[PDB]
Every structure is written in structure tokens, then in C-alpha cells.
Amino acid sequence: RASHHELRAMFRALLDSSRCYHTASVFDPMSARIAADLGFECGILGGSVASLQVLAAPDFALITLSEFVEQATRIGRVARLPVIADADHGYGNALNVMRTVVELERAGIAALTIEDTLLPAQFGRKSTDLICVEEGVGKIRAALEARVDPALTIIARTNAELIDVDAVIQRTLAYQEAGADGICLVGVRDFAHLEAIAEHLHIPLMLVTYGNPQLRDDARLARLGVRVVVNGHAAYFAAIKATYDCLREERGALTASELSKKYTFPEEYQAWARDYME
Amino acid sequence: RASHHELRAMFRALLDSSRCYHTASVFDPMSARIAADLGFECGILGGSVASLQVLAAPDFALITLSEFVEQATRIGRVARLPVIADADHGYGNALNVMRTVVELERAGIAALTIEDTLLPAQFRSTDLICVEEGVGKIRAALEARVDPALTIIARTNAELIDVDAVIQRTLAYQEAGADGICLVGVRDFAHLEAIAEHLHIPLMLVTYGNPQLRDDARLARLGVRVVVNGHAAYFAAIKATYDCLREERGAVASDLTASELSKKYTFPEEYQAWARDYME
Amino acid sequence: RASHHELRAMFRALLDSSRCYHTASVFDPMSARIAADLGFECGILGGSVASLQVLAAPDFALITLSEFVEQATRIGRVARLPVIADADHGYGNALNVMRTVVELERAGIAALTIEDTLLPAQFGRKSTDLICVEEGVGKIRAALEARVDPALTIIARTNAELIDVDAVIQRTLAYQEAGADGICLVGVRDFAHLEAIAEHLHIPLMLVTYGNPQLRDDARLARLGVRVVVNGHAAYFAAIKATYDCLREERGAVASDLTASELSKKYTFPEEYQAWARDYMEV
Amino acid sequence: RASHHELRAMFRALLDSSRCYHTASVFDPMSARIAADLGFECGILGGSVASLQVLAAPDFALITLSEFVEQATRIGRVARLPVIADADHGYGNALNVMRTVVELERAGIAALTIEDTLLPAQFGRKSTDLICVEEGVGKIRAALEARVDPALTIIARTNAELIDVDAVIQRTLAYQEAGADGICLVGVRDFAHLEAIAEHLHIPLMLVTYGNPQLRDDARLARLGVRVVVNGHAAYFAAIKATYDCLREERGAVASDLTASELSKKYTFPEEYQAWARDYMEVK
Ligand SMILES: O=C([O-])C(=O)[O-]
Ligand SMILES: O=C([O-])C(=O)[O-]
Ligand SMILES: O=C([O-])C(=O)[O-]
Ligand SMILES: O=C([O-])C(=O)[O-]
Ligand SMILES: [Mg+2]
Ligand SMILES: [Mg+2]
Ligand SMILES: [Mg+2]
Ligand SMILES: [Mg+2]
């Protein structure tokens, strides 16, 4: 019964509240139904999980925009809670970002992130790098132009592990001024790190913590402007382990995250990158 | 490194052997990779698991042929064991059948089954199309084939119709040139034995863990090469996802089995309500 | 600028005018942009043409719902005029009909037709018959239930050619009863025929005439309640002929004397599909 | 009748002959059926034409690999002549190239081109810049590794317009050494330009000429190793103009003055895409 637009209103309501919320990992229609049934307030479609499902591949931007959108569209037919799409770098330059936004808003997603990582991996650079802030600003501005339903939330994402706090403040302030509805940060260490970045932000914050034990004080998160916390996709690795255990028993022939990692053939992709990209 | 054609050769080799093999449930790339790691000889992409994956929907012919093919294509990019696709009734009449063969063969599947169930549910029951129509769908499938190593398997339902009629159909399909026969609903080694008698092509059983059919040396002797135990591996995954999120939430979780859980999130009463409302 | 919802308001606003409208054939992004630039009020995405573009195939329900929705989706990204999708039989029973509406409404189309033709062609029966009126009413009800944006127009279509006029009036009334926003008619012979049918409908009418000279009168049509007229897909066949003639001239080959419709039919390989239908679908 | 594999052998036999062949523009199943009926030896699916068909958009790498592949798949269900796919840069880095080859091969294409253009366009940087030759070699070697059917023809494409002859010579030799099956060249000026680049190649050449009148001589081209000429995608433009002409006369509008190509460009909304590039991809 909630439409794509109504789901966007619900998400905005979470953001205007004075609490933060932990996302359920929602990657397909079954998991979306599960999350809603357990009473989760919002979910997240991760780019990493889409890449496991479509391709059994590492999180290397191998999936195409169409493939990511098919995943989102399948979730959008059944989702009764608002779903955030991790939309990587927008699948190209700022013109590709427009299309990312059109496709995902139509798929029925409640909110999406665009991040300023230089993707896909560059020739010879075994470093993960960020695009210049000027490019990043144009991508956020491009995303906001492409939006049709103004209830859609556009979250600018950056990586605070890569760069120093003063560059994170600079970029995130620039994205706020560009019109971002929220700021998403990955790589934040602890509360001192967070307070330094949160100080000059007045739009809601989204945190990708991957179960960081030094960011478990939710009351403190919320009063620093954090509304959404993402801990990762254990629920997907648990499904992979279950499938394996069942088949292994049927046959008579590693943790869950190690098992999921193994089936991405990381060594094969690592050999290709060495042989063709360095 | 094995091509789509080589996997067809490997599957034919199993059918020519003296043994019968038990499929792994293979519904996506991760599962295809797990099945091969575990040493399975062949895999099976069931229409019902595609329906849960794409739609969280019951096994009601709701997925389009393109969706079903998308699932098969994703598998074909990684599969190192031959995989059988359950292709339902071939997604329409005999001319639609030719498209399903073309689509699934290109996606890289090793064998497919075409069943004579009248799908989708007619405005009735689980009926069967006439034997003449079924023969013509099989001849059409075999025509549509390009790679001759591709195995075309003709499927019928034995649970309902009397064994004469099953003997009747399956003989006609054998006559029409099918590479093998797929049987669902066989009761026991006696019932198998009857249908098996006048057949010289490989047999495939969808038993669903039927306890009365567990002798592999004996199924083989009778001409069975492939046994499909079901899709518990898929339910395990749903349960596991549910359990992890339920723990994360601090909610207090069901006492449903992996299968009752899977069925629940298929919303079967909505679909049952719509059928009663719009198709009665 | 105009959103999928605003296009639906425009289409509703046409159906509530006292005027008749002639569709442009809108089959892809470029044709949609052409048709808007020319001032057309609405377009139609025909299933026959989707089948030409996707498959080079006759109009035999060979294309999948997904393929058809992909065509609608492409159009939806550019369309500044409202577009009607010919959704054939809803790609299955009433359960499939519901998916058909969900998919096409999400694609962005302003209106869609569900017809009561028995599809795909069934075994033995060399003619193409209609589902019983009750399966028809169940289909139409399921379509309306599946709709989310109430501004989406759901149109019930039937064939006024084979079955006698009374059987027709019966079907249309039941559809109108069932809650259809409009009726679509194929194979109306003439105004005598139309008037019989128009008489006890009060919901907007749409006509697929195929150029029928007996129905050429717009003021009259509108007074009878017709709001949309589909003349066909000549603009697609013109594209086929232009591609043929350009390549023929680059090659240095002799001219063909087939017309644009003739060339388009030829490239569907109709004889091949016929041999298969005789070989595999007749006793 | 001809399988995807059989089509590749037919393509290879063109390459092995002593003649140059002119592609038909083949962008969907009806056009593939037309080209075959007319007796064309081979066809070409242009990425530019895919962008017009899927998006009504200019050739700006806006189409996804999945969209390109769907176009190529439609064609592959009916093609009776070998079709070359213009695969742009492989839709990302060398690892994306692998997937490009996988998808188009399975689609049933006879041959594909991978170009060393830096794509998509860079924030301010320059839309026609090339990647370094080392990255180009890695992309070519990745395509060749990704190939399953050995009959598939893999062509390394470069742009001779803006870089110097010695640089084209360097890149083409290195793609030849990397094992490319052919070399495709866009932006060749004339026979002297061509002769310099052709001189140290021994694999078949493909030329994208865009009607360049300084390169019209089949015998003379074939003697330099040219096997395939792509003259452009006029046949698509003609199909657009025909649709325009038909609806406009249906409407009662005045006849258009614009050529087929002018009218096709108009409906890509070039000014809109240009304004967006200005506003979002240039320093403020
Ligand atoms: O890709 C992911 O899973 C993410 O960034 O959350
Ligand atoms: O649908 C299924 O899962 C089957 O028949 O194996
Ligand atoms: O398919 C068509 O073109 C129609 O029914 O209008
Ligand atoms: O894109 C094109 O049309 C080409 O590169 O030939
Ligand atoms: Mg991610
Ligand atoms: Mg099944
Ligand atoms: Mg139609
Ligand atoms: Mg190109």
C-alpha cells in the first residue's frame, strides 16, 4: 500500500526525528519482506551485495547500472519500508549520474548515495582515490537536477579514512552547500573524529560503521546529527553459509564472510588486475 | 574454462554412464560456485526458486521468460558443472517454446525440460495439455535447438493421471525425438517400473525427497540418470537471512521451518485472494 | 519537465474534452521526441511494432512482458506527450495482468489497453477467439486493483469484427461495469455499427480503425464518445523502407517494387512462422 | 541456418580474401534482415546508433553495457551475415573489457572493436584524449583472454586524427604485438596518412571513414591490407527522417528543410546535454 512517494515521506520522517536508526540489509524481494516483518524502519541495497548476487564478484564496479537497477526494481515491487540505494559513483561522470538518479528513482528507491571515489579502479593506481571536490560538487548538483520526485533523498558520500579531517570538512561542507539532503561517511574512527566533521554540518548524517565498537553510543550519534547507521551485510553472508552447509551435507563433502569472499574468486580478479592493469 | 558446449558434452557423458546423479540446487552464481566446489556433477535451476528470487512470488508462472533467462544467464557466466533449467511449459505455445530454447541455449544452459502442464492457471486446476499439443511442443523445441549437444527433456506429471496415460504420453514424447523424460509424482519403484518399461531414453525424477525411491543402483538399472531432490538449499538461505536480521533487531523470531518461512514471505494469501476474486 | 503523473493528467484532460484525437505512432525515444515536436496530443506504443523492433516477428505474442516494458521504459525517459501502451491480453491470466499494469505504470505510460483475445494462439483452433466475458471482467478488475497512481487510464479493448454486435455490447457493458476508464474497439465496420455500441457506454471510447473509410468523420465520432483514434503504424513502415532504400543505394542494387508495408511484412519471415505453426500446432 | 560460430568463419574468410568490403549499418533485427537480403557481406552495430535507439542521446557513453548488449542480442537472433560490434572502450577498465567481450560474444557478434579513447568524458580534461598505450595493451590482452570461441574476431581501434603518425604507429604495433586480430582506424586523412600506418602492420585493417572522399578506392585500400570500410550510419538517419516525414504529413505540418542527419541530431537535444556538461563538468 505505501507507494514509492509515501516511502520517501517515511524516510524523511526518520531523518527529521531526533533518533538514529540501524538499517536492515535489503538486497532482494525476500529480504525486503523479512526486514519489514521484523519492524525495521529502513533498509539498504548495497553495491557489494548486488555484485555478489548478479555476478559472484568483488565490489569492483563490474555490475552495470542496468544490473544494479534490476536489483532495486525487484526490491521496489515488494518493499514496505524505505530502501536506500548505494549507487557508487553514479556509474560514470556527472552525465552518467543523472541517469543513475532517473533509473533508481523510477525503480522505486527512497534514497540514494553518490560517493566521490574514483571508480572503476584506475590503471596502475593500487590506491583507491577520490575525485577532486569540484568534480564531486558537480556530480551532487547533477544528481539533484535529475531528481523528479522532490521527496527523493540524495545523499553525498565520502571516505574519511582516506583523507585528513580538514579535507573531509571541506568536501562535506561543499556538498552541503551544493544542496545534498544528507552526508554519508565511511571510515570514521571514533567520536572525536565524528565531532570534528559533524561540527559544521546542519543536514542529517549517515554512517557506514561496519560494526565499529567505538561508535555504539546511539544517543550521542543522534545528537551529533546522525540519523542512519549501516553495519554491513552479515545477513547476506549468513544466507551464503546456509546454502553451502545444506549442499555440503547433501553431498558428504571458514566463517560466513570468509565463505562469501571465497566464492568471488578474489585471486582470479587479483591476477587479472596484476596482469592487465599494472 | 569449460564452454557452454563442453558442459553439454559433460552432461551427455553422465546420461551415457551406468549411474544416476543427484542435482545440486543452483539458482545463482554464488550457488553455482558452491555446487562445483563441493564436487556436484550437475545442477538444477528451478522455476519456483527463480520466482522467489525475482518476485518473492509462488510458483505460479508469474516470471516472464526474460526474467527466467536473466537468472540462467547470470549462472552461465560462472558455471563449471552442467546446469539443467526447468523451463516450465516453454512460456506459451509451440512457437513460444522455440524462443525459450533459443534464449536458454544462448544463456548457456546444458539441458532444459519442457512440461505438458497447462500454464498459466486457466480460468479450473493443474491440468495437462493434450498429448498432440505436447508432441508438437517437443518437436518445436528440438527444431529450435542449434547446438546438437543441448539436451531437450520432456516433462510430465504422474501423480494425477492414471499410469496408462503417463505411459501413453511419455511414449509419444519419446517417439517425437526428446532426449530424455522427466517424471514428477511417481509413487514407488513399482510405479516407476511400469512407466519405465517401454522407454529407451534417459529418465529424470523430481522426487522431492520421496522416501520410497532411494536406491540409486536400482534407479540407474531402470534408466534414471538424474534425480532432483528439491530446493532446501534455497530455503536454508532465507531462514539464515531471517535469523541474522531477527537477532540484529532483538525481535523474537518464528518457530517456522526454513520452508514455512520461505512460503510465508511469498504472501500466499494475497495471491490466493486475487485468484478467488478475479479468476472464479 | 512533465512527470509521469502530469502526463497522465494531460491524457485524462483529453478524455474529458469534447474532441477526438489521432495518435502518433510512438515506438521509441526518437519517435516520441518527433511526435511531441509536431504537436501531437498523444502517442501509441503498439504491440505489433514492439514485435517488429525487438524480434522482426509478426504480431503473434512472441515478445515477453519484459521486452515490451523495456520499449515503454525507453520512451518514458523522453516523452513530453502522453503515451498509450497496447498491452495485448496482459501477458497471461488476471494474475499476469496485474504485473503488466505494475510494470507499464512504473515505465511511465499514461494509459494501457487490455484486450479479451485468447492469446497466445491455442492448439488446433486455426482462428483467434475471445476469452469468455467473465474471464474478461476478472482481467479488467485485476488491472484496476494493480494500479497505484489513480491518474493511470486503464482501457478495456475488444474485437467488434467476428462476434455479432450483441455479444459485443454484452462484453463492453460488463467491462464498463467492472470499472474500465474507457473502451477500445477494433473492427467496427461503419457508423451504423458504432452507434449500436456507443449507445449504452458513457466512458471514453478509443478506435483502432486501420484507415477504415467508413469511419472517417471526427465531429461525429466525438459526439458518439470516441476520444482517441488509432490509424496504424505507417510511420514505422516508412522507417523500414527508408533503411532498405539507403542500404540498397550504398550497395548499388536494383530498386525493389514492394511498398513500405510489403517490405516490413517480408522481413518478419511470415512464411517461416506459418510452416512452424502448421508443423507443430495442427493435428 | 548459420550459427554464431559459422558467422565468425564467414567473417574470417572476408579478412582472408584479397578484397575490401563495405559494412551495412545493422542496428536491429529488421535492418539485419534487410542487409542480408541485399547480399551485404558484413554489418556494423555502432555504439552511436545504439545510443540514438535506446536513449535518443548523442555518442557520450550514456548507454550501459547491458543496453548495448541487449541491442546486439536482438540482432543475433536473426543475423545471416557476420556483424561487427563497436564496443567503445570496453565500458570501464580492463576488467570491464572482459565482461564486454563475454556479453557480446554470447550475444552472437562475429567481431568487436575496443578503442583506446578515454571514456566517458573527464571533468574539464578533454573528450577525445586517449589512455596511455600501456593501458591500451592491457585492455586488448584482457579482451583476448576473455574470448571463449577462438573464431571471434577482436579488433583494436585507435584514433589517428589528433595524435601524431609515430604515436599511431606505436599504439597499433603494440596492439598487433598484444595479439589483436585486426586494427581499426578512425580519423585517417588520406592515402599518404594511411600508407605510413599500414606499412608495418600485417593484420587486417578496418577503416572508419565517415565518407572521406580522399579514401575511396577499394582496390588500392585492399592492397594496403584494408578489409572492412565503415562509411557511416546514414541508413539509421534515413529511418528517423522517414518517421518524421510520415508523422509530419499525417499532422498537416510543413515539410522539413533539414537533412536526415541534421534532423537526427536535433532530436538528441544536443544543447541540453551541452548545458549540463558546462554546469556540472567545468570548474565554476
Ligand atoms: O557496497 C556496500 O555494501 C556499501 O557500501 O554499503
Ligand atoms: O520449480 C521447481 O523448483 C522445479 O520444478 O524443480
Ligand atoms: O499492435 C498494434 O499495433 C495494435 O494493436 O494497435
Ligand atoms: O559509434 C559509432 O557509430 C562508431 O563508432 O562507428
Ligand atoms: Mg558500495
Ligand atoms: Mg518448475
Ligand atoms: Mg496489438
Ligand atoms: Mg562508437
CSV table of N, CA, C and O in Angstrom, one decimal, chain D residues 191-254:
chain,number,residue,atom,x,y,z
D,191,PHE,N,45.5,8.8,-48.4
D,191,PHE,CA,46.4,7.6,-48.7
D,191,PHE,C,47.8,7.7,-48.1
D,191,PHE,O,48.3,6.7,-47.7
D,192,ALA,N,48.4,8.9,-48.2
D,192,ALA,CA,49.7,9.1,-47.5
D,192,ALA,C,49.7,8.8,-46.0
D,192,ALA,O,50.5,8.1,-45.5
D,193,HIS,N,48.7,9.4,-45.3
D,193,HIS,CA,48.4,9.1,-43.9
D,193,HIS,C,48.3,7.5,-43.7
D,193,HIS,O,49.0,6.9,-42.9
D,194,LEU,N,47.4,6.9,-44.6
D,194,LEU,CA,47.1,5.5,-44.5
D,194,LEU,C,48.4,4.7,-44.7
D,194,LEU,O,48.6,3.7,-44.0
D,195,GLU,N,49.2,5.0,-45.7
D,195,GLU,CA,50.3,4.2,-46.1
D,195,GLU,C,51.4,4.1,-45.0
D,195,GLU,O,52.0,3.1,-44.8
D,196,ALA,N,51.6,5.3,-44.3
D,196,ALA,CA,52.5,5.3,-43.2
D,196,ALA,C,52.1,4.3,-42.0
D,196,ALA,O,53.0,3.6,-41.5
D,197,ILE,N,50.9,4.4,-41.6
D,197,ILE,CA,50.3,3.5,-40.6
D,197,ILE,C,50.2,2.0,-41.1
D,197,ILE,O,50.5,1.1,-40.3
D,198,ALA,N,49.9,1.8,-42.3
D,198,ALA,CA,49.7,0.4,-42.9
D,198,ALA,C,51.0,-0.3,-43.0
D,198,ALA,O,51.1,-1.6,-42.9
D,199,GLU,N,52.1,0.5,-43.2
D,199,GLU,CA,53.4,0.0,-43.6
D,199,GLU,C,53.9,-1.2,-42.8
D,199,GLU,O,54.4,-2.2,-43.3
D,200,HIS,N,53.8,-1.1,-41.4
D,200,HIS,CA,54.4,-2.1,-40.6
D,200,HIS,C,53.3,-3.0,-39.9
D,200,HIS,O,53.7,-3.6,-38.9
D,201,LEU,N,52.1,-2.9,-40.4
D,201,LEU,CA,51.1,-3.9,-39.9
D,201,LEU,C,50.9,-5.0,-40.9
D,201,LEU,O,51.1,-4.8,-42.1
D,202,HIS,N,50.7,-6.2,-40.3
D,202,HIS,CA,50.4,-7.3,-41.2
D,202,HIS,C,49.1,-8.0,-40.8
D,202,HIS,O,48.8,-9.1,-41.3
D,203,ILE,N,48.3,-7.4,-39.9
D,203,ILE,CA,47.0,-7.9,-39.6
D,203,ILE,C,45.9,-7.0,-40.4
D,203,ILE,O,46.2,-5.9,-40.7
D,204,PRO,N,44.8,-7.6,-40.7
D,204,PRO,CA,43.7,-6.8,-41.5
D,204,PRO,C,43.4,-5.5,-40.9
D,204,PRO,O,43.2,-5.3,-39.7
D,205,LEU,N,43.2,-4.5,-41.8
D,205,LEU,CA,42.7,-3.2,-41.3
D,205,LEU,C,41.2,-3.0,-41.5
D,205,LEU,O,40.6,-3.5,-42.5
D,206,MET,N,40.7,-2.2,-40.6
D,206,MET,CA,39.3,-1.7,-40.7
D,206,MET,C,39.4,-0.2,-40.7
D,206,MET,O,40.1,0.4,-39.8
D,207,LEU,N,38.7,0.5,-41.5
D,207,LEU,CA,38.7,1.9,-41.6
D,207,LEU,C,37.4,2.4,-41.3
D,207,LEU,O,36.4,1.9,-41.9
D,208,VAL,N,37.3,3.4,-40.4
D,208,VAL,CA,36.0,4.2,-40.2
D,208,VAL,C,36.2,5.5,-40.9
D,208,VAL,O,36.8,6.4,-40.4
D,209,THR,N,35.6,5.7,-42.1
D,209,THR,CA,35.9,6.8,-43.0
D,209,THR,C,35.0,8.0,-42.9
D,209,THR,O,35.4,9.1,-43.2
D,210,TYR,N,33.7,7.7,-42.5
D,210,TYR,CA,32.8,8.8,-42.5
D,210,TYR,C,32.6,9.5,-43.8
D,210,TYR,O,32.6,10.8,-43.9
D,211,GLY,N,32.6,8.7,-44.9
D,211,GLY,CA,32.6,9.2,-46.2
D,211,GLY,C,33.8,10.0,-46.8
D,211,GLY,O,33.6,10.6,-47.8
D,212,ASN,N,34.9,9.9,-46.1
D,212,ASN,CA,36.1,10.7,-46.5
D,212,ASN,C,36.4,10.4,-48.0
D,212,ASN,O,36.7,9.2,-48.4
D,213,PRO,N,36.3,11.4,-48.9
D,213,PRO,CA,36.4,11.2,-50.4
D,213,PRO,C,37.9,10.9,-50.8
D,213,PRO,O,38.1,10.4,-51.9
D,214,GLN,N,38.8,11.3,-49.9
D,214,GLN,CA,40.2,11.0,-50.1
D,214,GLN,C,40.7,9.6,-49.9
D,214,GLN,O,41.9,9.2,-50.0
D,215,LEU,N,39.7,8.7,-49.5
D,215,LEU,CA,39.9,7.3,-49.3
D,215,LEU,C,39.0,6.4,-50.1
D,215,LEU,O,38.7,5.2,-49.7
D,216,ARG,N,38.5,6.8,-51.2
D,216,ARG,CA,37.6,6.0,-51.9
D,216,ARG,C,38.2,5.3,-53.1
D,216,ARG,O,38.2,5.7,-54.2
D,217,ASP,N,38.8,4.1,-52.8
D,217,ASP,CA,39.4,3.2,-53.9
D,217,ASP,C,39.6,1.8,-53.3
D,217,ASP,O,40.6,1.6,-52.7
D,218,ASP,N,38.6,0.9,-53.6
D,218,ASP,CA,38.6,-0.4,-52.9
D,218,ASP,C,39.9,-1.2,-53.2
D,218,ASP,O,40.5,-1.7,-52.2
D,219,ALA,N,40.3,-1.3,-54.5
D,219,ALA,CA,41.5,-2.0,-54.8
D,219,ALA,C,42.7,-1.5,-54.1
D,219,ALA,O,43.6,-2.2,-53.7
D,220,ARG,N,42.9,-0.2,-54.2
D,220,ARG,CA,44.0,0.5,-53.5
D,220,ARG,C,44.0,0.3,-52.0
D,220,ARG,O,45.1,0.0,-51.4
D,221,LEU,N,42.8,0.4,-51.4
D,221,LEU,CA,42.7,0.1,-50.0
D,221,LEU,C,43.1,-1.4,-49.6
D,221,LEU,O,43.9,-1.6,-48.7
D,222,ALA,N,42.6,-2.3,-50.4
D,222,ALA,CA,42.8,-3.7,-50.2
D,222,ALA,C,44.3,-4.1,-50.3
D,222,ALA,O,44.8,-4.9,-49.5
D,223,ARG,N,45.0,-3.5,-51.2
D,223,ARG,CA,46.4,-3.6,-51.4
D,223,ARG,C,47.2,-3.2,-50.1
D,223,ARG,O,48.2,-3.7,-49.8
D,224,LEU,N,46.7,-2.2,-49.4
D,224,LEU,CA,47.3,-1.8,-48.1
D,224,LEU,C,46.9,-2.6,-46.9
D,224,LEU,O,47.3,-2.4,-45.7
D,225,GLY,N,46.1,-3.7,-47.1
D,225,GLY,CA,45.7,-4.5,-46.0
D,225,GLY,C,44.3,-4.2,-45.4
D,225,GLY,O,43.8,-4.9,-44.5
D,226,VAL,N,43.6,-3.2,-46.0
D,226,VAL,CA,42.3,-2.9,-45.6
D,226,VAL,C,41.3,-4.0,-46.0
D,226,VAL,O,41.2,-4.3,-47.3
D,227,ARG,N,40.5,-4.5,-45.1
D,227,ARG,CA,39.5,-5.5,-45.4
D,227,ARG,C,38.0,-5.0,-45.2
D,227,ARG,O,37.1,-5.7,-45.8
D,228,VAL,N,37.8,-4.0,-44.4
D,228,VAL,CA,36.5,-3.5,-44.0
D,228,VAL,C,36.5,-2.0,-43.9
D,228,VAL,O,37.4,-1.4,-43.3
D,229,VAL,N,35.6,-1.4,-44.7
D,229,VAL,CA,35.3,0.0,-44.6
D,229,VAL,C,33.9,0.3,-44.0
D,229,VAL,O,32.9,-0.2,-44.5
D,230,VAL,N,33.8,1.2,-43.0
D,230,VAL,CA,32.6,1.6,-42.4
D,230,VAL,C,32.4,3.0,-42.9
D,230,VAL,O,33.1,3.9,-42.5
D,231,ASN,N,31.4,3.3,-43.8
D,231,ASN,CA,31.2,4.6,-44.3
D,231,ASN,C,30.3,5.5,-43.5
D,231,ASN,O,30.3,6.7,-43.7
D,232,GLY,N,29.7,4.9,-42.5
D,232,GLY,CA,28.8,5.8,-41.6
D,232,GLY,C,27.5,5.1,-41.3
D,232,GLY,O,27.4,3.9,-41.6
D,233,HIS,N,26.6,5.8,-40.8
D,233,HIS,CA,25.3,5.2,-40.3
D,233,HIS,C,24.1,6.0,-40.9
D,233,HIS,O,23.1,6.2,-40.2
D,234,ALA,N,24.3,6.4,-42.1
D,234,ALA,CA,23.2,7.1,-42.9
D,234,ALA,C,21.9,6.4,-42.9
D,234,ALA,O,20.9,7.1,-42.8
D,235,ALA,N,21.9,5.1,-43.0
D,235,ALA,CA,20.6,4.2,-43.0
D,235,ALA,C,19.8,4.4,-41.8
D,235,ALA,O,18.5,4.4,-41.9
D,236,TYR,N,20.4,4.5,-40.7
D,236,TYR,CA,19.6,4.9,-39.5
D,236,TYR,C,19.0,6.3,-39.5
D,236,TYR,O,17.8,6.5,-39.1
D,237,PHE,N,19.8,7.3,-39.9
D,237,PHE,CA,19.3,8.7,-40.1
D,237,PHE,C,18.2,8.7,-41.1
D,237,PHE,O,17.3,9.6,-40.9
D,238,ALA,N,18.2,7.8,-42.1
D,238,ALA,CA,17.2,7.8,-43.1
D,238,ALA,C,15.8,7.3,-42.6
D,238,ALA,O,14.8,7.9,-42.9
D,239,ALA,N,15.9,6.4,-41.7
D,239,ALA,CA,14.8,5.8,-40.9
D,239,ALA,C,14.1,6.8,-40.0
D,239,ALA,O,12.9,7.0,-40.0
D,240,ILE,N,14.9,7.6,-39.2
D,240,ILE,CA,14.5,8.8,-38.5
D,240,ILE,C,13.8,9.8,-39.4
D,240,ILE,O,12.7,10.2,-39.1
D,241,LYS,N,14.4,10.3,-40.5
D,241,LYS,CA,13.8,11.2,-41.4
D,241,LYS,C,12.5,10.7,-42.0
D,241,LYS,O,11.5,11.4,-42.1
D,242,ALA,N,12.4,9.4,-42.3
D,242,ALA,CA,11.2,8.8,-42.8
D,242,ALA,C,10.0,8.9,-41.8
D,242,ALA,O,8.9,9.2,-42.2
D,243,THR,N,10.3,8.6,-40.6
D,243,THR,CA,9.3,8.7,-39.5
D,243,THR,C,8.8,10.1,-39.3
D,243,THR,O,7.6,10.4,-39.3
D,244,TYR,N,9.8,11.0,-39.3
D,244,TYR,CA,9.5,12.4,-39.2
D,244,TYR,C,8.5,12.8,-40.4
D,244,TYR,O,7.4,13.2,-40.2
D,245,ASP,N,9.0,12.5,-41.6
D,245,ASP,CA,8.2,12.8,-42.8
D,245,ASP,C,6.8,12.3,-42.8
D,245,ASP,O,5.8,13.0,-43.1
D,246,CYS,N,6.6,11.0,-42.3
D,246,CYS,CA,5.3,10.4,-42.3
D,246,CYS,C,4.4,11.1,-41.2
D,246,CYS,O,3.2,11.4,-41.5
D,247,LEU,N,4.8,11.3,-40.0
D,247,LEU,CA,4.0,11.9,-38.9
D,247,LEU,C,3.7,13.4,-39.2
D,247,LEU,O,2.7,13.9,-38.9
D,248,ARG,N,4.7,14.1,-39.8
D,248,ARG,CA,4.5,15.5,-40.1
D,248,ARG,C,3.5,15.6,-41.2
D,248,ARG,O,2.7,16.5,-41.2
D,249,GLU,N,3.5,14.7,-42.2
D,249,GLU,CA,2.4,14.8,-43.2
D,249,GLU,C,1.0,14.4,-42.7
D,249,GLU,O,0.0,14.9,-43.1
D,250,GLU,N,1.1,13.4,-41.8
D,250,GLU,CA,-0.1,13.0,-41.1
D,250,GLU,C,-0.7,14.2,-40.3
D,250,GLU,O,-1.8,14.5,-40.3
D,251,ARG,N,0.2,14.9,-39.6
D,251,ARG,CA,-0.2,16.1,-38.8
D,251,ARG,C,-0.7,17.3,-39.7
D,251,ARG,O,-1.4,18.2,-39.2
D,252,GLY,N,-0.3,17.4,-40.9
D,252,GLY,CA,-0.5,18.6,-41.7
D,252,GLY,C,0.5,19.7,-41.5
D,252,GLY,O,0.2,20.8,-41.8
D,253,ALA,N,1.7,19.3,-41.0
D,253,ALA,CA,2.7,20.3,-40.8
D,253,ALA,C,3.5,20.6,-42.1
D,253,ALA,O,3.4,19.8,-43.1
D,254,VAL,N,4.2,21.7,-42.2
D,254,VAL,CA,5.0,22.0,-43.4
D,254,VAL,C,6.2,20.9,-43.5
D,254,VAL,O,6.6,20.3,-42.4
